[PDB]
mmCIF file of N, CA and C in Angstrom:
data_model
loop_
_atom_site.group_PDB
_atom_site.id
_atom_site.type_symbol
_atom_site.label_atom_id
_atom_site.label_comp_id
_atom_site.label_asym_id
_atom_site.label_seq_id
_atom_site.Cartn_x
_atom_site.Cartn_y
_atom_site.Cartn_z
ATOM 1 N N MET A 245 -18.198 12.709 -1.325
ATOM 2 C CA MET A 245 -17.899 11.288 -1.304
ATOM 3 C C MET A 245 -18.486 10.585 -2.530
ATOM 4 N N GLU A 246 -17.645 9.794 -3.179
ATOM 5 C CA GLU A 246 -18.065 9.064 -4.362
ATOM 6 C C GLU A 246 -17.972 7.556 -4.117
ATOM 7 N N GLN A 247 -19.069 6.873 -4.410
ATOM 8 C CA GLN A 247 -19.125 5.433 -4.226
ATOM 9 C C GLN A 247 -19.283 4.731 -5.575
ATOM 10 N N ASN A 248 -19.394 3.412 -5.511
ATOM 11 C CA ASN A 248 -19.551 2.615 -6.716
ATOM 12 C C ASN A 248 -20.235 1.294 -6.363
ATOM 13 N N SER A 249 -21.297 0.998 -7.099
ATOM 14 C CA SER A 249 -22.046 -0.225 -6.874
ATOM 15 C C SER A 249 -21.638 -1.285 -7.900
ATOM 16 N N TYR A 250 -21.859 -2.538 -7.530
ATOM 17 C CA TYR A 250 -21.520 -3.647 -8.405
ATOM 18 C C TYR A 250 -22.368 -4.879 -8.081
ATOM 19 N N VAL A 251 -22.135 -5.936 -8.846
ATOM 20 C CA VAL A 251 -22.868 -7.176 -8.652
ATOM 21 C C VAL A 251 -21.879 -8.341 -8.577
ATOM 22 N N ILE A 252 -22.133 -9.231 -7.629
ATOM 23 C CA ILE A 252 -21.277 -10.390 -7.441
ATOM 24 C C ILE A 252 -21.655 -11.468 -8.459
ATOM 25 N N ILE A 253 -20.637 -11.982 -9.135
ATOM 26 C CA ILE A 253 -20.849 -13.016 -10.134
ATOM 27 C C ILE A 253 -19.978 -14.228 -9.799
ATOM 28 N N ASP A 254 -19.211 -14.089 -8.728
ATOM 29 C CA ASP A 254 -18.332 -15.160 -8.291
ATOM 30 C C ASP A 254 -19.049 -16.005 -7.237
ATOM 31 N N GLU A 255 -19.135 -17.298 -7.519
ATOM 32 C CA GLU A 255 -19.790 -18.220 -6.607
ATOM 33 C C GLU A 255 -18.969 -18.371 -5.325
ATOM 34 N N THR A 256 -17.783 -17.782 -5.346
ATOM 35 C CA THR A 256 -16.896 -17.843 -4.197
ATOM 36 C C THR A 256 -17.179 -16.682 -3.241
ATOM 37 N N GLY A 257 -17.925 -15.711 -3.747
ATOM 38 C CA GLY A 257 -18.274 -14.545 -2.953
ATOM 39 C C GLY A 257 -17.020 -13.860 -2.404
ATOM 40 N N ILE A 258 -16.849 -12.607 -2.797
ATOM 41 C CA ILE A 258 -15.702 -11.833 -2.353
ATOM 42 C C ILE A 258 -15.156 -12.436 -1.058
ATOM 43 N N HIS A 259 -13.969 -13.015 -1.166
ATOM 44 C CA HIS A 259 -13.328 -13.630 -0.016
ATOM 45 C C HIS A 259 -12.134 -12.781 0.421
ATOM 46 N N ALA A 260 -11.309 -13.370 1.274
ATOM 47 C CA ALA A 260 -10.132 -12.682 1.775
ATOM 48 C C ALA A 260 -9.144 -12.469 0.627
ATOM 49 N N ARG A 261 -9.215 -13.366 -0.345
ATOM 50 C CA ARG A 261 -8.337 -13.289 -1.500
ATOM 51 C C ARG A 261 -8.483 -11.930 -2.189
ATOM 52 N N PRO A 262 -9.704 -11.695 -2.741
ATOM 53 C CA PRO A 262 -9.986 -10.445 -3.427
ATOM 54 C C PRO A 262 -10.179 -9.302 -2.427
ATOM 55 N N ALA A 263 -11.026 -9.558 -1.442
ATOM 56 C CA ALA A 263 -11.307 -8.563 -0.420
ATOM 57 C C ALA A 263 -10.002 -7.878 -0.009
ATOM 58 N N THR A 264 -8.914 -8.625 -0.131
ATOM 59 C CA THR A 264 -7.605 -8.105 0.222
ATOM 60 C C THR A 264 -7.175 -7.024 -0.771
ATOM 61 N N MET A 265 -7.127 -7.414 -2.037
ATOM 62 C CA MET A 265 -6.735 -6.493 -3.089
ATOM 63 C C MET A 265 -7.623 -5.246 -3.086
ATOM 64 N N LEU A 266 -8.925 -5.486 -3.051
ATOM 65 C CA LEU A 266 -9.887 -4.397 -3.043
ATOM 66 C C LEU A 266 -9.612 -3.488 -1.844
ATOM 67 N N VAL A 267 -9.515 -4.112 -0.679
ATOM 68 C CA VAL A 267 -9.256 -3.374 0.546
ATOM 69 C C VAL A 267 -7.898 -2.678 0.439
ATOM 70 N N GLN A 268 -6.930 -3.417 -0.081
ATOM 71 C CA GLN A 268 -5.587 -2.886 -0.243
ATOM 72 C C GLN A 268 -5.600 -1.690 -1.197
ATOM 73 N N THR A 269 -5.946 -1.973 -2.444
ATOM 74 C CA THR A 269 -6.003 -0.935 -3.459
ATOM 75 C C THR A 269 -6.914 0.208 -3.004
ATOM 76 N N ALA A 270 -7.794 -0.117 -2.069
ATOM 77 C CA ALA A 270 -8.724 0.867 -1.542
ATOM 78 C C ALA A 270 -7.953 1.898 -0.714
ATOM 79 N N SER A 271 -7.412 1.430 0.401
ATOM 80 C CA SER A 271 -6.650 2.297 1.284
ATOM 81 C C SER A 271 -5.309 2.654 0.640
ATOM 82 N N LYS A 272 -4.711 1.658 0.003
ATOM 83 C CA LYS A 272 -3.431 1.853 -0.656
ATOM 84 C C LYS A 272 -3.363 3.273 -1.219
ATOM 85 N N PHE A 273 -4.512 3.752 -1.671
ATOM 86 C CA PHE A 273 -4.597 5.089 -2.233
ATOM 87 C C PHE A 273 -4.474 6.153 -1.141
ATOM 88 N N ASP A 274 -5.591 6.397 -0.470
ATOM 89 C CA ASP A 274 -5.621 7.384 0.597
ATOM 90 C C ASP A 274 -7.073 7.638 1.007
ATOM 91 N N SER A 275 -7.853 8.109 0.045
ATOM 92 C CA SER A 275 -9.255 8.398 0.292
ATOM 93 C C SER A 275 -9.840 7.365 1.257
ATOM 94 N N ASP A 276 -10.925 7.758 1.909
ATOM 95 C CA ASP A 276 -11.587 6.880 2.858
ATOM 96 C C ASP A 276 -12.693 6.103 2.140
ATOM 97 N N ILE A 277 -12.293 5.001 1.523
ATOM 98 C CA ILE A 277 -13.237 4.165 0.801
ATOM 99 C C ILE A 277 -13.947 3.236 1.787
ATOM 100 N N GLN A 278 -15.213 2.974 1.496
ATOM 101 C CA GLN A 278 -16.012 2.106 2.346
ATOM 102 C C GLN A 278 -16.763 1.077 1.497
ATOM 103 N N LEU A 279 -16.936 -0.103 2.072
ATOM 104 C CA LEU A 279 -17.633 -1.177 1.384
ATOM 105 C C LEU A 279 -19.104 -1.174 1.801
ATOM 106 N N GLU A 280 -19.952 -1.585 0.869
ATOM 107 C CA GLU A 280 -21.381 -1.635 1.127
ATOM 108 C C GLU A 280 -22.005 -2.844 0.425
ATOM 109 N N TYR A 281 -23.034 -3.389 1.058
ATOM 110 C CA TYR A 281 -23.723 -4.543 0.507
ATOM 111 C C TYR A 281 -25.171 -4.602 1.000
ATOM 112 N N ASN A 282 -26.087 -4.349 0.077
ATOM 113 C CA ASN A 282 -27.504 -4.371 0.403
ATOM 114 C C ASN A 282 -27.750 -3.510 1.643
ATOM 115 N N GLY A 283 -27.264 -2.279 1.575
ATOM 116 C CA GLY A 283 -27.424 -1.350 2.681
ATOM 117 C C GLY A 283 -26.475 -1.697 3.831
ATOM 118 N N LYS A 284 -25.630 -2.685 3.581
ATOM 119 C CA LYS A 284 -24.671 -3.121 4.581
ATOM 120 C C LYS A 284 -23.301 -2.519 4.265
ATOM 121 N N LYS A 285 -23.062 -1.343 4.828
ATOM 122 C CA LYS A 285 -21.801 -0.654 4.615
ATOM 123 C C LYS A 285 -20.796 -1.099 5.678
ATOM 124 N N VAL A 286 -19.529 -1.095 5.289
ATOM 125 C CA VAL A 286 -18.466 -1.494 6.195
ATOM 126 C C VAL A 286 -17.182 -0.749 5.826
ATOM 127 N N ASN A 287 -16.086 -1.190 6.427
ATOM 128 C CA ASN A 287 -14.794 -0.578 6.172
ATOM 129 C C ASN A 287 -14.084 -1.343 5.052
ATOM 130 N N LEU A 288 -13.856 -0.639 3.952
ATOM 131 C CA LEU A 288 -13.189 -1.237 2.808
ATOM 132 C C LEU A 288 -11.683 -1.297 3.073
ATOM 133 N N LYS A 289 -11.339 -1.263 4.351
ATOM 134 C CA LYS A 289 -9.942 -1.313 4.752
ATOM 135 C C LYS A 289 -9.725 -2.510 5.679
ATOM 136 N N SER A 290 -10.783 -3.289 5.845
ATOM 137 C CA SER A 290 -10.721 -4.462 6.700
ATOM 138 C C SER A 290 -11.351 -5.662 5.990
ATOM 139 N N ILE A 291 -10.710 -6.810 6.154
ATOM 140 C CA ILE A 291 -11.196 -8.032 5.536
ATOM 141 C C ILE A 291 -12.341 -8.603 6.375
ATOM 142 N N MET A 292 -12.062 -8.780 7.658
ATOM 143 C CA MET A 292 -13.055 -9.315 8.574
ATOM 144 C C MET A 292 -14.451 -8.788 8.235
ATOM 145 N N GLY A 293 -14.481 -7.569 7.718
ATOM 146 C CA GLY A 293 -15.739 -6.942 7.349
ATOM 147 C C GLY A 293 -16.164 -7.356 5.939
ATOM 148 N N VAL A 294 -15.244 -7.180 5.001
ATOM 149 C CA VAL A 294 -15.509 -7.529 3.617
ATOM 150 C C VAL A 294 -15.830 -9.021 3.524
ATOM 151 N N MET A 295 -15.218 -9.782 4.420
ATOM 152 C CA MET A 295 -15.429 -11.220 4.450
ATOM 153 C C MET A 295 -16.787 -11.562 5.068
ATOM 154 N N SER A 296 -17.049 -10.954 6.214
ATOM 155 C CA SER A 296 -18.302 -11.183 6.914
ATOM 156 C C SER A 296 -19.436 -10.428 6.218
ATOM 157 N N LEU A 297 -19.109 -9.865 5.065
ATOM 158 C CA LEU A 297 -20.086 -9.116 4.294
ATOM 159 C C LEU A 297 -20.899 -10.083 3.431
ATOM 160 N N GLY A 298 -20.664 -11.367 3.655
ATOM 161 C CA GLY A 298 -21.363 -12.398 2.909
ATOM 162 C C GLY A 298 -21.583 -11.970 1.456
ATOM 163 N N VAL A 299 -20.516 -11.466 0.854
ATOM 164 C CA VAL A 299 -20.579 -11.017 -0.527
ATOM 165 C C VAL A 299 -20.880 -12.213 -1.433
ATOM 166 N N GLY A 300 -22.047 -12.800 -1.216
ATOM 167 C CA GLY A 300 -22.465 -13.949 -2.003
ATOM 168 C C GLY A 300 -22.670 -13.562 -3.469
ATOM 169 N N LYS A 301 -22.791 -14.583 -4.304
ATOM 170 C CA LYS A 301 -22.990 -14.366 -5.727
ATOM 171 C C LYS A 301 -24.401 -13.822 -5.962
ATOM 172 N N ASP A 302 -24.578 -13.207 -7.123
ATOM 173 C CA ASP A 302 -25.867 -12.640 -7.482
ATOM 174 C C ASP A 302 -26.213 -11.514 -6.504
ATOM 175 N N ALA A 303 -25.260 -11.215 -5.634
ATOM 176 C CA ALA A 303 -25.450 -10.167 -4.647
ATOM 177 C C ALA A 303 -24.802 -8.875 -5.149
ATOM 178 N N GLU A 304 -25.508 -7.775 -4.936
ATOM 179 C CA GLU A 304 -25.014 -6.475 -5.361
ATOM 180 C C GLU A 304 -24.317 -5.766 -4.197
ATOM 181 N N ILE A 305 -23.050 -5.447 -4.413
ATOM 182 C CA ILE A 305 -22.264 -4.771 -3.396
ATOM 183 C C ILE A 305 -21.964 -3.341 -3.856
ATOM 184 N N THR A 306 -21.359 -2.580 -2.956
ATOM 185 C CA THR A 306 -21.013 -1.200 -3.255
ATOM 186 C C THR A 306 -19.787 -0.771 -2.447
ATOM 187 N N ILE A 307 -19.135 0.274 -2.934
ATOM 188 C CA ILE A 307 -17.950 0.792 -2.270
ATOM 189 C C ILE A 307 -17.963 2.321 -2.333
ATOM 190 N N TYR A 308 -17.672 2.931 -1.193
ATOM 191 C CA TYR A 308 -17.647 4.380 -1.105
ATOM 192 C C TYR A 308 -16.210 4.900 -1.019
ATOM 193 N N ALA A 309 -16.060 6.183 -1.312
ATOM 194 C CA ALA A 309 -14.751 6.811 -1.271
ATOM 195 C C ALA A 309 -14.918 8.313 -1.031
ATOM 196 N N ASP A 310 -14.237 8.794 -0.001
ATOM 197 C CA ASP A 310 -14.301 10.204 0.346
ATOM 198 C C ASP A 310 -12.891 10.714 0.652
ATOM 199 N N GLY A 311 -12.237 11.210 -0.389
ATOM 200 C CA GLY A 311 -10.888 11.730 -0.246
ATOM 201 C C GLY A 311 -10.457 12.488 -1.503
ATOM 202 N N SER A 312 -9.160 12.440 -1.770
ATOM 203 C CA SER A 312 -8.609 13.114 -2.932
ATOM 204 C C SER A 312 -8.452 12.123 -4.087
ATOM 205 N N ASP A 313 -8.456 10.846 -3.734
ATOM 206 C CA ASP A 313 -8.316 9.795 -4.726
ATOM 207 C C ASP A 313 -9.613 8.985 -4.792
ATOM 208 N N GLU A 314 -10.565 9.385 -3.962
ATOM 209 C CA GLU A 314 -11.850 8.709 -3.916
ATOM 210 C C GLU A 314 -12.193 8.126 -5.288
ATOM 211 N N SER A 315 -12.432 9.022 -6.234
ATOM 212 C CA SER A 315 -12.770 8.611 -7.586
ATOM 213 C C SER A 315 -11.712 7.643 -8.118
ATOM 214 N N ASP A 316 -10.457 7.997 -7.880
ATOM 215 C CA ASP A 316 -9.349 7.170 -8.327
ATOM 216 C C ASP A 316 -9.411 5.815 -7.620
ATOM 217 N N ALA A 317 -9.834 5.856 -6.366
ATOM 218 C CA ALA A 317 -9.944 4.644 -5.573
ATOM 219 C C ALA A 317 -11.097 3.792 -6.107
ATOM 220 N N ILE A 318 -12.131 4.478 -6.572
ATOM 221 C CA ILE A 318 -13.297 3.799 -7.111
ATOM 222 C C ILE A 318 -12.927 3.134 -8.439
ATOM 223 N N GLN A 319 -12.063 3.811 -9.181
ATOM 224 C CA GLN A 319 -11.621 3.300 -10.467
ATOM 225 C C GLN A 319 -10.718 2.080 -10.272
ATOM 226 N N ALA A 320 -10.036 2.064 -9.136
ATOM 227 C CA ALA A 320 -9.138 0.967 -8.817
ATOM 228 C C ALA A 320 -9.957 -0.236 -8.344
ATOM 229 N N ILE A 321 -10.975 0.058 -7.548
ATOM 230 C CA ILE A 321 -11.839 -0.985 -7.022
ATOM 231 C C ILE A 321 -12.441 -1.776 -8.184
ATOM 232 N N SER A 322 -13.340 -1.120 -8.903
ATOM 233 C CA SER A 322 -13.995 -1.747 -10.038
ATOM 234 C C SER A 322 -12.982 -2.568 -10.839
ATOM 235 N N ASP A 323 -11.754 -2.070 -10.866
ATOM 236 C CA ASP A 323 -10.689 -2.744 -11.589
ATOM 237 C C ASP A 323 -10.330 -4.043 -10.864
ATOM 238 N N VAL A 324 -10.154 -3.925 -9.557
ATOM 239 C CA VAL A 324 -9.809 -5.077 -8.741
ATOM 240 C C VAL A 324 -10.968 -6.075 -8.761
ATOM 241 N N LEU A 325 -12.176 -5.532 -8.733
ATOM 242 C CA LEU A 325 -13.370 -6.359 -8.747
ATOM 243 C C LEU A 325 -13.429 -7.141 -10.061
ATOM 244 N N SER A 326 -13.295 -6.407 -11.156
ATOM 245 C CA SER A 326 -13.330 -7.015 -12.475
ATOM 246 C C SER A 326 -12.030 -7.779 -12.734
ATOM 247 N N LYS A 327 -10.962 -7.292 -12.118
ATOM 248 C CA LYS A 327 -9.660 -7.915 -12.272
ATOM 249 C C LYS A 327 -9.750 -9.384 -11.854
ATOM 250 N N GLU A 328 -10.462 -9.613 -10.762
ATOM 251 C CA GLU A 328 -10.634 -10.962 -10.248
ATOM 252 C C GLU A 328 -11.759 -11.677 -10.999
ATOM 253 N N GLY A 329 -12.856 -10.956 -11.183
ATOM 254 C CA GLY A 329 -14.006 -11.507 -11.880
ATOM 255 C C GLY A 329 -15.150 -11.797 -10.907
ATOM 256 N N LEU A 330 -15.131 -11.082 -9.792
ATOM 257 C CA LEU A 330 -16.158 -11.251 -8.777
ATOM 258 C C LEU A 330 -17.440 -10.551 -9.233
ATOM 259 N N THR A 331 -17.284 -9.688 -10.226
ATOM 260 C CA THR A 331 -18.416 -8.951 -10.760
ATOM 261 C C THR A 331 -18.387 -8.964 -12.290
ATOM 262 N N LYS A 332 -19.509 -8.571 -12.874
ATOM 263 C CA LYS A 332 -19.625 -8.533 -14.323
ATOM 264 C C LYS A 332 -18.890 -9.733 -14.920
#
């Protein structure tokens, strides 16, 4: 299983807007990607979780992936994350 950590830079804190794309692009692949935040792991396939993940700004989040696209899913995430600008 391959994961990926990041830092929130969006004062909006990963919301349903992005959480959607991330979650989407996450499962959209196949691998079993999971969201994490300050030891708070969840399902990167559900918003209710990514949303209730209080992905506040200045907060460091993470995402896991265990499949055949895991790495590919991780590459998509960071992309979606940076794509929106919730991180870096």
